[PDB]
Amino acid sequence: ESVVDLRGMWIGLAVLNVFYLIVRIYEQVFGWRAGLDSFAPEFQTYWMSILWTEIPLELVSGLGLAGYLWKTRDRNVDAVAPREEMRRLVVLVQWLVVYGIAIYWGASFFTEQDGAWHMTVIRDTDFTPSHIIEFYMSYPIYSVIAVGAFFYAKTRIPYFAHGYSLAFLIVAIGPFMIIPNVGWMALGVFGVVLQILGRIHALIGKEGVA
């Protein structure tokens, strides 16, 4: 046993960061001479190919991940040894770090990216390269990852099982309320980490050591 692992995190991080780097390189190259005119055939082969593809892929990945975490749920969750609970919630904190990064890419990088593109084209379509990546990829990805963190907590930690953490609810559902044109935000990660800390605090009575 080791209560701290972290392999899963680095995998999720490397896989996620190199993917978006590929996406950024891909749009630097095919943004010009593919993405400027949405009536051209190139737009179909380089941009709409992504769109038509990613939506079902994200939808299956989302239902597939939840369904899996539920089938593999701990049916004997109230019985969890203090140590294994400590591990499971270090794993939750892993999920939340990946989600941290996903949110950065989705809500900072690609969202403000759309800003510059609006000053580049006059828009043939709702589906600009910017939008294909931002609204139809970047956002659903972290939406998925958020639903996974929630489902992991609901299925592994007694506390997040029987209940629904109001804060964690806001975290999983809030994304499905992002809409632009044409303060109630997600930041409930605050409550979620306090619940975790609430729990780490309780998993030691002899805490003069800190």
């Binding site: 899963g8 995998i11 896989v15 993917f19 082969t45 992504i50 593809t53 892929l57």
Partner: peptide
Amino acid sequence: AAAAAAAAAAAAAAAAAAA
């Protein structure tokens, strides 16, 4: 071209085969 379902199908699968 089809780094649509490429790097994305491959990012989803290197994950699922690490369970």
